[PDB]
Amino acid sequence: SMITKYLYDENAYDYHDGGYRPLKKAPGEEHPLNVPAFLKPDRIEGNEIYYTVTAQAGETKILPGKPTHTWGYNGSILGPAIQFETGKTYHVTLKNELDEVTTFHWHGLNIVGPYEDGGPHAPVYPHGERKITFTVDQPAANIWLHPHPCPETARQVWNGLAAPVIITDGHEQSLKLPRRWGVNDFPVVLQDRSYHDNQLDYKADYDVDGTLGDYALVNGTVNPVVNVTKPIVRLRFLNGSNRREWRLHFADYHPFTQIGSDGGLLPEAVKMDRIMLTCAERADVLVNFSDYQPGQEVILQTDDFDLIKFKIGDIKKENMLLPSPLAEIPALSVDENTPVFKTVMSGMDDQVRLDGKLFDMQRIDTRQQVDQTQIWEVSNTNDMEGGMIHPFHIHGCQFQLIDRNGHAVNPNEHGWKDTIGVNPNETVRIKVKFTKLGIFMYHCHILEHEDTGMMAQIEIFDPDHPIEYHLMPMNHK
Ligand SMILES: [Cl-]
Numbered sequence: 428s429m430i431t432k433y434l435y436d437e438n439a440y441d442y443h444d445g446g447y448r449p450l451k452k453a454p455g456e457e458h459p460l461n462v463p464a465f466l467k468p469d470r471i472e473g474n475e476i477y478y479t480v481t482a483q484a485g486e487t488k489i490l491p492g493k494p495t496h497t498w499g500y501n502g503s504i505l506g507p508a509i510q511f512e513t514g515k516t517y518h519v520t521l522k523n524e525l526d527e528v529t530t531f532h533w534h535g536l537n538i539v540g541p542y543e544d545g546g547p548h549a550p551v552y553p554h555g556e557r558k559i560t561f562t563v564d565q566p567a568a569n570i571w572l573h574p575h576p577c578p579e580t581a582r583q584v585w586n587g588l589a590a591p592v593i594i595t596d597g598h599e600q601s602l603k604l605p606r607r608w609g610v611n612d613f614p615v616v617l618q619d620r621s622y623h624d625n626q627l628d629y630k631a632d633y634d635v636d637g638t639l640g641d642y643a644l645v646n647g648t649v650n651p652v653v654n655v656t657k658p659i660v661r662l663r664f665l666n667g668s669n670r671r672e673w674r675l676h677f678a679d680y681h682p683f684t685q686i687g688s689d690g691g692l693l694p695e696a697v698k699m700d701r702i703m704l705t706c707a708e709r710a711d712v713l714v715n716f717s718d719y720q721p722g723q724e725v726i727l728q729t730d731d732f733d734l735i736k737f738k739i740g741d742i743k744k745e746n747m748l749l750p751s752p753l754a755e756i757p758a759l760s761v762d763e764n765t766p767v768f769k770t771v772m773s774g775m776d777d778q779v780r781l782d783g784k785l786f787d788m789q790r791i792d793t794r795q796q797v798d799q800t801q802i803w804e805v806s807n808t809n810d811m812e813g814g815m816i817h818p819f820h821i822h823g824c825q826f827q828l829i830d831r832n833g834h835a836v837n838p839n840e841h842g843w844k845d846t847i848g849v850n851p852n853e854t855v856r857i858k859v860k861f862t863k864l865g866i867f868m869y870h871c872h873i874l875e876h877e878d879t880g881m882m883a884q885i886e887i888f889d890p891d892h893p894i895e896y897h898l899m900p901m902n903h904k
C-alpha cells in the first residue's frame with residue numbers, strides 16, 4: 428500500500444488549460460543547487476531572538492551571459508533560511524529597500540493580524556521599516572515568507588521575493604532526521620520563470636489565469652545538481668510558483684517517504700512514488716539513495732521533465748527507520764451547536780470570485796470567535812471538463828481535513844494543512860480553530876487569482892475583550 432497516484436483530479440490539471448506551456452530545458456551548464464545559509468540573529472537576550480530581514484534589489488547569475496536583475500531578502504534573489512523555534516519570542520525588523528511598497532507575510536505562521544501577519548494591511552513603504560514581535564506557538568513545520576501587497580503580490584513573488592522558513596521543536600528534534608544543511612537536508616523551492624534578454628518581465632508574461640514560466644528555477648538555480656554523499660536525504664519541497672503544479676517523481680519511480688505537510692509532521696510517514704503540489708503547498712520528504720551505485724545519476728522529474736540531478740557519490744548504505752506514530756496530531760472538536768460555514772470559489776481567468784465577490788480591503792466578510800473550532804465547507808464550482816484546481820489558503824491558522832466530497836481525504840492530509848487544492852465540482856470540509864485575535868485573509872493561492880480579488884477577510888474576536896480595527900481603503904496608487 429505505497430501511494431502510486433497523484434492525489435488531485437487529472438481532468439483538471441494545469442495542462443488542460445488552453446494557454447498552458449510545458450517546461451523546457453534552460454540554457455547553460457549544470458550548476459550545483461543553491462542552498463541558502465541560515466539567517467544569523469542580530470542579538471539573543473533570554474528566550475528573545477532578534478532578526479533583521481531586508482527586501483532589496485540585486486543581480487543574480489542565472490543563465491549564460493548577463494546577470495538577471497532580481498529581488499531578494501538579504502541578498503539578490505530568494506532569501507536566507509530563517510529558523511524559528513516553538514516557545515521562543517522573535518523581534519524582527521522588516522526593512523524595505525525597494526522603490527515600492529511591500530509586506531512581509533509569514534505564510535503558515537500563527538501570528539496575530541492584520542499587522543504582524545504582514546498581509547495587505549501592513550505596508551512597509553520604500554526605505555521604511557516595521558518591527559514585529561511574536562512568540563511561536565505551533566509545532567515544527569516548513570513555512571515561508573513572501574510579500575503580500577494587494578494587488579502586486581504575483582509580480583513581487585515573480586521578481587524574486589520568497590524565503591524558506593523552518594520551525595523546530597522538541598518532538599522533531601527527538602527524531603533521527605538527516606540534518607546537515609546542504610549535505611543531507613535541503614530546501615527545494617520550486618518555481619518557473621521566463622526570461623527576456625536574461626531579464627524578468629512580469630508584464631510581458633502575465634496571464635490573469637496564472638502566470639507560467641518556461642524554465643524550472645529551483646532555489647534560484649537552473650539545471651540544478653545535488654551531490655549525494657550520505658544516502659538518506661531530506662527534501663523540503665515548496666511550490667513557490669504563481670500557478671504551475673509540480674507532479675514530482677524519480678525517473679524510475681523510486682519510492683520516497685512523506686513525513687510532513689504544510690503545518691507539520693504527519694501522524695504517520697506515507698510511502699509514495701510520486702506527489703503533486705499546488706501553489707504554496709509543502710511536502711517534507713525522505714529519500715533513501717542506498718540501492719543505487721556510486722557514479723549513478725538519479726533524476727527527479729516533474730511530469731516527463733528532468734528537474735534535479737542527483738549524483739550518487741561514495742555512499743555507505745543505510746536504512747531510514749521512523750517511529751509509528753510519527754507525531755501526535757490533537758483532534759480539534761466542534762461544538763455541534765455551530766453551523767458549517769460555506770465558502771464558494773467560482774470562475775476562472777478574470778471571472779474568478781469568492782462567494783460571488785471580489786476582495787474589498789474595508790469589508791469584513793465573516794467573523795468567528797477565538798479558540799472555537801468551526802467546520803468550513805469549501806467548494807469549487809468550475810466544470811469537471813474545462814475547470815481548474817484552486818489552492819485554497821487561510822491565514823493565521825493550521826487546519827485539519829474532514830472529507831473531500833464525503834469520502835476520505837487524501838492519504839497525506841491527516842495532519843495539519845494550510846493550503847488545500849480544491850478540484851472542480853468538489854466540496855471539501857475542514858476544521859478551523861483560530862488561536863490568535865485579529866483580521867485574517869482567506870483566498871486562492873494562484874497569485875493572479877488573489878490579485879484579481881479571489882480573496883476575503885475574517886475577524887477573529889474575544890467577547891468582552893473586544894477591539895475595534897481601523898481598516899483603511901487601499902491607498903490610491
Ligand atoms: Cl537537471
Ligand SMILES: [Cu+2]
Pocket residue numbers: 532533534535820821822823
Ligand atoms: Cu498566508
Ligand SMILES: [Cu+2]
Pocket residue numbers: 779816817818871872873876881
Ligand atoms: Cu483560483
